[PDB]
């Protein structure tokens, strides 16, 4: 169950110069597409797209590299082998660990401001700790869906393999009104609904 | 077009961190190579147990990238990039419930180069404990982002600051939190 690499091709305020590399594998419908990027500072100057089948000088700073690598069938055939080699291999390692990692969302409904139940207020649905990022967060007022006045922060990555989202509705609560936040996610077998009663 | 994006991202530069080799699955970092310790560090224990990564792969890629850096310092006639200042956001991991342990996240985003100083402040005082951090995480725009963490217990008579330092900043930037 080992991770495989592709060796980047060899080329050739305080003082600082940076070189960045990117080896991206895009898995879709049993296929793999590979993108090798050579970036000087923030300038991607030369790249290899498996869909192109050859190196291309993204900027003119990569013209010597595009020229040289494309003149070398050994380097071209090695880079072309990447989608079916390391991309495929690495993708096929990850069983229900990364490809099927599921973390259930924790849901909390709380109004933004405290006070009398008649005025303008924001009702917050703080959906937390889920994985993957794809989530559906709906707002309901007395069983009917509220589409208008829904202020969303959009998907927030916590950088710890969990996400969060704050979906809030602009509400003018009347006494006895039932506000329901409904979350749908792959980790959930049924929707998770959290209620707020007007008070 | 992709169901998933598995990517190896690496950088090499003159200032600290002098290099970084990492692997990310769907924008989240799975593992990286501690270049000094010459060993793989996994993000979650369940990764280290399920998989392996020979750290030599990381070191080999960094050596090539250092060669590539040198060639480009020359080719570009020592072109140093503009220092892109960071956008800093502070937000809790969990909803704030006074008395219940939570984690404060500091997201230092959209900066270049990956040369940064970050400190957590509780009531204007430096916090040394319950602190963790991400690597200099890659962005599709070849800029960087980083996450700093602080385990804290929310109390109304406490405030927090994320004091960040970057070259693109005229002075340290403090992002305040409740």
């Amino acid at each position, epitope marked *: 169950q080992a991770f495989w690499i592709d060796l980047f091709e*060899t080329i050739g305020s305080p003082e600082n110069y940076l070189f960045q590399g990117r080896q991206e594998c895009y898995a879709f419908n049993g296929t793999q597409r590979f993108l090798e990027r050579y970036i000087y500072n923030r300038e991607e100057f030369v790249r290899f797209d498996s869909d192109v089948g050859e190196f291309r000088a993204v900027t003119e700073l990569g013209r010597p590299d595009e020229e040289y690598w494309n003149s070398q069938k050994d380097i071209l055939e090695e880079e072309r082998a990447v989608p*079916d080699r390391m991309c495929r291999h690495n993708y096929e390692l990850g069983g229900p660990m990364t490809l099927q990692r599921r973390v259930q969302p924790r849901v909390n409904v709380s109004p933004s401001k405290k006070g009398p139940l008649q005025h303008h207020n924001l009702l917050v649905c703080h959906v937390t700790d889920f994985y993957p990022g794809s989530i559906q967060v709906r707002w309901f007022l007395n069983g009917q869906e509220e589409t208008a006045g829904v202020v969303s922060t959009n998907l927030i990555r916590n950088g710890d393999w969990t996400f969060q989202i704050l979906v809030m509705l602009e509400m003018t609560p009347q006494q006895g009104d039932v506000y329901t936040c409904q979350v749908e996610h792959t980790s959930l077998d049924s929707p998770v609904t959290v209620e707020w009663k007007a008070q | 077009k992709a169901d998933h994006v598995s990517t190896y991202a690496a950088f090499v530069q003159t200032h600290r961190p002098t290099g970084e080799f990492m692997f990310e699955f769907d924008e989240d970092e799975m593992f990286y190579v501690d270049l000094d310790k010459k060993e793989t560090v996994w993000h979650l224990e369940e990764f280290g147990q399920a998989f392996s990564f020979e750290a030599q792969g990381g070191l080999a890629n960094i050596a090539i990238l250092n060669n590539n850096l040198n060639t480009l310092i020359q080719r570009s006639n020592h072109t140093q990039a503009t220092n892109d200042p960071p956008e800093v956001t502070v937000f809790p991991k969990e909803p704030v419930e006074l008395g219940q342990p939570n984690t404060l996240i500091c997201h230092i985003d959209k900066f270049f180069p990956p040369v940064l100083n970050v400190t957590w402040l509780c009531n204007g005082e430096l916090v040394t404990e319950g602190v963790a951090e991400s690597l200099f995480l890659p962005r599709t725009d070849y800029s960087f982002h980083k996450f700093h963490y602080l385990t804290f217990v929310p109390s109304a008579e406490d405030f927090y600051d994320c004091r960040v330092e970057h070259w693109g900043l005229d002075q340290p930037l403090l992002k305040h939190w409740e």
Partner: T-cell receptor, first 112, second 114 residues
Framework: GVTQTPRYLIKTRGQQVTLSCSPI?????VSWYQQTPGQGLQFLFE???????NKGNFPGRFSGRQFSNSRSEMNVSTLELGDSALYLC????????????FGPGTRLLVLE | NSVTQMEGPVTLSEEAFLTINCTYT??????LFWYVQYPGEGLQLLLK?????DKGSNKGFEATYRKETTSFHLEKGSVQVSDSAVYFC??????????????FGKGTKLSVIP
């Protein structure tokens, strides 16, 4: 392209040999093989950027090195009669080292 | 992880049909090769195939990467006297740090009789 020196060698059991390899410009992957009628092609070791990436199953007396210019040298100490073989050297431009370019070899004969 | 190829020294008349059998047994992703060793020199790449169904073609020789039979059988329609050499079948498997190691079969000598 791939050059190997010396072309032919006669040694007595117990002596030592150093075999040089000049890979093609600018191949950095250098592999060494022992060719025998008895065992065929037997992998010795492979070098890339001075480091020994892989090693075959040969005793410690069979050692190798690679210089900054990618040239390689292999050494066989405490020579045995059974070390008599063709010491092939192969370079590769592709850094993975699959597409190999073989040298003419060093024909080594070990005698009593 | 081995390469099993056609035994002993094959001897054929000029213009004959050649088949040098080669079967592999390896860890899911190998690339397949045919190396040729002409009398007196070192090996030389003749043909290669990356993935299953890929065909290697050079000097009128052809071998198909066949996953079904796990084989890379070398074929030539009409052999030339110049083809007298020793043919090696080979595997390419990942050997760490983005490197690959060749695994050769025990060579097949071919004598083409004019």
């Amino acid at each position: 392209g791939v050059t190997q020196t010396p072309r032919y060698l006669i040694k007595t059991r117990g002596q030592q040999v150093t075999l040089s390899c000049s890979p093609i410009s600018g191949h950095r992957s250098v592999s060494w093989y022992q060719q025998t009628p008895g065992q065929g092609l037997q992998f010795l070791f492979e070098y890339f950027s001075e480091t020994q990436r892989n090693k075959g199953n040969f005793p410690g007396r069979f050692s190798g090195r690679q210089f900054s210019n990618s040239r390689s040298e292999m050494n066989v100490s405490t020579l045995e009669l059974g070390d008599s073989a063709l010491y092939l050297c192969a370079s590769s431009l592709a850094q993975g080292g699959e597409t190999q370019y073989f040298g003419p070899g060093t024909r080594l004969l070990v005698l009593e | 992880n081995s390469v099993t190829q056609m035994e002993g020294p094959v001897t054929l008349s000029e213009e004959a049909f050649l088949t040098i059998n080669c079967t592999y047994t390896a860890t899911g992703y190998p690339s397949l090769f045919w190396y040729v060793q002409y009398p007196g020199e070192g090996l030389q790449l003749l043909l290669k195939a990356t993935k299953a169904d890929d065909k290697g073609s050079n000097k009128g020789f052809e071998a198909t990467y066949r996953k079904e039979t796990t084989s890379f059988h070398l074929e030539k329609g009409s052999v030339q006297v110049s083809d007298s050499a020793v043919y090696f079948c080979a595997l390419s498997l990942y050997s760490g740090a983005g490197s690959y190691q060749l695994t050769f079969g025990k060579g097949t000598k071919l004598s083409v009789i004019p």
